[PDB]
Design an enzyme around this catalytic site. Structure first.
Site: not given
Ligand SMILES: Cc1ccc(-n2nc(C(C)(C)C)cc2NC(=O)NCc2cc(F)ccc2Oc2ccc3c(cnn3CCO)c2)cc1
Length: 334
Positions: A157, A25
């Site tokens: 991230d 959260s």
């Molecule tokens: C303004 C801004 C916005 C986004 C970003 N950005 N940039 C990147 C990269 C890779 C390019 C560096 C990734 C992101 N954003 C996310 O990664 N959002 C999380 C997310 C995304 C979903 F589509 C679905 C779920 C998500 O939450 C999760 C994801 C993995 C998880 C869990 C739990 N376990 N695990 C695995 C182990 O823990 C939860 C940067 C800046």
């Protein structure tokens, strides 16, 4: 079009996603769920107040665009996008493959040198793909790395920063920690910190603050040379560095005792103080320490990414129309 359901310390959504359990959260939250259709365990991120100001609306659009353009085995891969709101004029959700658990609770367990090889190879194979789209991570801490029992690794991230639980500054590069300049090698500095902490099992630069962090980093990499000092865009910081009692370059062999020789050598390469001298993701892949898994053809490069929209600072209202366009036109992978 699919049937949505409700449940609560926040409320959530299609029927296909069941067994909702909370995860993070954070300031901007997340759920771990089970997708009945695919049969996989998924991660579900909910964007709270995505349109209360154009800044996090820009974050919203940036996130969705990127995640759509991200398709790499060692990088998070978008799976589903949905909203219960009933029309374009009207909360949003992101879904991705849920890996076992992050890296924090696994640094404390089990690692052999070949495990470190495989891990850091996955990380660098992801970072090549990321940096070849002209994208910088910045916030590359262990808790943003996803791992499963098979030692598969997905980069991630959800900082979801300014810390001054594993503190983020311990892995932030010196220059990005002091706005001295930066090129993408800040991520490689983070990778160096991480590989060192794995092999040694403890924090490399456990800085208590900016100053202490910097002092710890120098106590290893030594004081800057006359050249690098030129590279600083801060005369107060310049006089401060020049003031610090000089520190000589420690021999990493002395520090990384009983460590794979090639491991200590790559660490030497990934922890250069000068940003324009550290080794690159691909040059590190070419390193012999990874010659066991090094496969240049199996290290694809991300196709171009149209970041033109960053300069387009739009009105409060109309940006949700373009975010809706990027939502509806999503294409799940078979
Ligand atoms: C303004 C801004 C916005 C986004 C970003 N950005 N940039 C990147 C990269 C890779 C390019 C560096 C990734 C992101 N954003 C996310 O990664 N959002 C999380 C997310 C995304 C979903 F589509 C679905 C779920 C998500 O939450 C999760 C994801 C993995 C998880 C869990 C739990 N376990 N695990 C695995 C182990 O823990 C939860 C940067 C800046």
């Amino acid at each position: 079009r699919p049937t949505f359901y409700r449940q609560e310390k926040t409320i959530w959504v299609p029927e296909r996603y069941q067994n909702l359990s909370p995860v993070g959260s954070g300031a901007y939250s997340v759920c771990a769920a089970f997708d009945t259709k695919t049969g996989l365990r998924v991660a579900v991120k909910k964007l709270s107040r995505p349109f209360q100001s154009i800044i996090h609306a820009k974050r919203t659009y940036r996130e969705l665009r990127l995640l759509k353009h991200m398709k790499h085995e060692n990088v998070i891969g978008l799976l589903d996008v949905f909203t219960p709101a009933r029309s374009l004029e009207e909360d949003v959700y992101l879904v991705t493959h849920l890996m076992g658990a992050d890296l924090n609770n696994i640094v404390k367990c089990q690692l052999t040198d070949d495990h470190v090889q495989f891990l850091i190879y996955q990380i660098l194979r992801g970072l090549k793909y990321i940096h070849s789209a002209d994208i910088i991570h910045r916030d590359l801490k262990p808790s943003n790395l996803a791992v499963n029992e098979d030692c598969e690794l997905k980069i991630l991230d959800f900082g979801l920063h300014t810390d001054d639980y594993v503190a983020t500054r311990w892995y932030r590069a010196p220059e990005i920690m002091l706005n001295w300049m930066y090129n993408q090698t800040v991520d490689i500095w983070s990778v160096g910190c991480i590989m060192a902490e794995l092999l040694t099992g403890r924090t490399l630069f456990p800085g208590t603050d900016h100053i202490d962090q910097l002092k710890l980093i120098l106590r290893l990499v030594g004081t800057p040379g006359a050249e690098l000092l030129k590279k600083i865009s801060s005369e107060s910081a310049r006089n401060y560095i020049q003031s610090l009692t000089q520190m000589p370059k420690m021999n990493f062999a002395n520090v990384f005792i009983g460590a794979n020789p090639l491991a200590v050598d790559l660490l030497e390469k990934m922890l250069v103080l000068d940003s324009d001298k550290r080794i690159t993701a691909a040059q590190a892949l070419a390193h012999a320490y990874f010659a066991q898994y090094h496969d240049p053809d199996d290290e694809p490069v991300a196709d171009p990414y149209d970041q033109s929209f960053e300069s387009r600072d739009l009105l409060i209202d109309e940006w949700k129309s373009l975010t809706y366009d990027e939502v509806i036109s999503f294409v799940p992978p078979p």
